[PDB]
Symmetry: C3
Subunit: 201 residues, 3 copies
């Protein structure tokens, strides 16, 4: 019976040791799971709330980049996120459209496109050169039109210049000058009549 | 021999105390870690499967909004997501080009841009008015064109109106009235010459 | 007291069974959080580091598609992600602009919009046919202009064709011919007067 009691104290002795062992083991198991759960929680991306209708990214003022996004189907009503390489595809066409539009306007203003054209501000204004046809027609719905601002053109045998009202007035003058001379001539004729009548010898 | 029993019992009492403490540490430590994990599990954004090739946002048929997204690099083949700021910039440009286009068509119609213009319905037509040069040329690949539809231009000393065919004709109808005049006097003169070769008195 | 011994042997056997139970408890509780975490670990989407400046999706080289994205706000400074449907809409507009730009250029180079038109390669070039007025004006900043390349207009009392300098020449050539007759005529008249002077019957 000395041996029964002795046995018991040994058992207790070992139990005490085991309890201390377990204590440290539990302390460190628990602290492990915590650190891991904690870091996951500190790196995981999260829905704002239970509805999951919004994710407000966690980078702060400068915000957060999302990279390695596969190109999203670009179709009517697609719910896929689009990347910068897809936005760039569009930015190229738009920038082209912007250019083609500027190039048109700075081509109409400086008159290098259209039927009526002029290469430089001091240049011959040309009307439908590259095309053919025999006729230019200036009439409109109010009727025919006067063509003004017309500087007089060369008057020779090969001239294609158009002529103006001053050049017409000049002609008109000659005519009246000549009708006058002719009238004088007729007078001069009447006189020769009377002289052949009235003379004697 | 007798005291040993008593001493064993106090040892048991403190052993039993410690087992209680441990059981109580464990329950609270694990309950705590299990909650943080639960919250984490419900709220975290996830990949659909182990390929990580897809994220189907959990917001139901309405979808999820992702925000505080940083400006993805807008470059060829970029894989950064792009936000609404960046799409808005393109959209303005598109509205810019769209509204550029519409107005270019309207004005070409309205005759308020280019070399030839006309403010309104009964406004005068102008040709190259804000530019220089001293020549308008209507020759095409078929050669010189007849310019027509021209209203009769004023005839006087400073008239810069072109002359039409109704006018040139008139001038000619005066020349044929002069040639008539000369024909008459040519005959009168011939008749005078006979009278004078014959008279005696 | 022998009853007391076995009673103590017994409670010690239970303490030992209970330390065991506790070692079982902790292992299965800890493994349980471990699995639940490792699963979270492998499918949660992750921030790259603690700044949360970047999420590099785990899809590998080909990438991750993000789907079920709700239309983001489109407005200056918006940090909402945007989806394929949205890019599609902008893409549609760009396409329409692209076509209209090219359609416009082609219409200019064909002579079919504006006031100066020509519905056919060998056709009547028309000026402001559809609108009205009575004025075409070709005067720039260098003053008035010489309209050239003008083919010989028709000459009759209803013609509305502009006449060129070569046709003016005809007028001024008849004119001289008139004067030459008038000159020879005047001389004949003087010859007649001097004849009436010296004639002795
Ligand atoms: Cl565009
Ligand atoms: Ni006589």
């Amino acid at each position: 019976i000395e041996d029964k009691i002795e046995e018991i104290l040994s058992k207790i002795y070992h139990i005490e040791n085991e309890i201390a062992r377990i204590k440290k083991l539990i302390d460190s198991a628990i602290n492990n799971v915590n650190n891991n759960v904690n870091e996951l929680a500190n790196n995981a991306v999260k829905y704002d709330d239970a509805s999951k209708d919004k994710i407000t990214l966690g980078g702060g003022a400068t915000g957060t980049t999302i990279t390695n996004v596969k190109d999203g189907t670009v179709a009517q009503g697609s719910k896929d996120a689009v990347n910068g390489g897809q936005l760039w595809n569009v930015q190229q066409q738009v920038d082209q459209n912007t250019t083609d539009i500027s190039n048109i306007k700075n081509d109409i203003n400086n008159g290098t496109v259209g039927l009526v054209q002029q290469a430089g501000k001091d240049a011959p204004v040309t009307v439908a050169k590259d095309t053919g046809g025999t006729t230019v027609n200036v009439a409109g719905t109010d009727g025919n039109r006067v063509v003004t601002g017309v500087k007089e053109g060369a008057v020779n045998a090969t001239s294609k210049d158009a002529v103006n009202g001053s050049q017409m007035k000049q002609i008109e003058d000659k005519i009246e000058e000549i009708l006058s001379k002719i009238y004088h001539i007729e007078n001069e004729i009447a006189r020769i009549k009377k002289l052949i009548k009235l003379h004697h010898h």
